Coordinates of C-alpha atoms in Angstrom, one line a residue:
X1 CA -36.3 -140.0 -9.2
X2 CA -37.9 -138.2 -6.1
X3 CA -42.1 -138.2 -6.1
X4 CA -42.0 -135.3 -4.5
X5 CA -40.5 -133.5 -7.6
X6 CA -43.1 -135.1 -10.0
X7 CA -46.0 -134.5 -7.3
X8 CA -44.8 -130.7 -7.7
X9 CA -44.5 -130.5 -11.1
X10 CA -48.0 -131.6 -11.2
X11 CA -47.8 -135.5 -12.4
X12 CA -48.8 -138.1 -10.7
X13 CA -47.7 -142.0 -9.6
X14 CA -49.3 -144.7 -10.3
X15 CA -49.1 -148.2 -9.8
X16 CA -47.3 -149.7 -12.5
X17 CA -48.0 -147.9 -15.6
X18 CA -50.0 -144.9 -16.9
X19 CA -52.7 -144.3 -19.4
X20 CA -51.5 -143.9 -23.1
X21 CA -52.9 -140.7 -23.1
X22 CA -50.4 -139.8 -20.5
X23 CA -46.4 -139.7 -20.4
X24 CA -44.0 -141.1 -18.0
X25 CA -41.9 -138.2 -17.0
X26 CA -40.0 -139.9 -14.5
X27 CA -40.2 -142.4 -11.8
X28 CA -41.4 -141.8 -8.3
X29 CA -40.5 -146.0 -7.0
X30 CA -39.8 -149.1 -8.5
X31 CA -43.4 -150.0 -8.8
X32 CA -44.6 -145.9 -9.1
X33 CA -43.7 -144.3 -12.2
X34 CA -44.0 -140.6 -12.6
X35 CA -46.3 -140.2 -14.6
X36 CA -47.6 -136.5 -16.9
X37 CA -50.7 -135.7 -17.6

């Protein structure tokens, strides 16, 4: 997806992966997922 759209909603990309504790919502990059916190 677009980061821009996550970075809006209020998640954040990573590198990689995110915490467990955390939810990937979507996918900013190929290496960058989206990630909601």
């Amino acid at each position: 997806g677009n980061s821009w759209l996550c970075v809006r909603r209020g998640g954040n990309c990573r590198f990689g992966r995110c915490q467990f504790a955390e939810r990937q919502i979507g996918r900013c990059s190929a290496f960058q997922p989206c990630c909601g916190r």
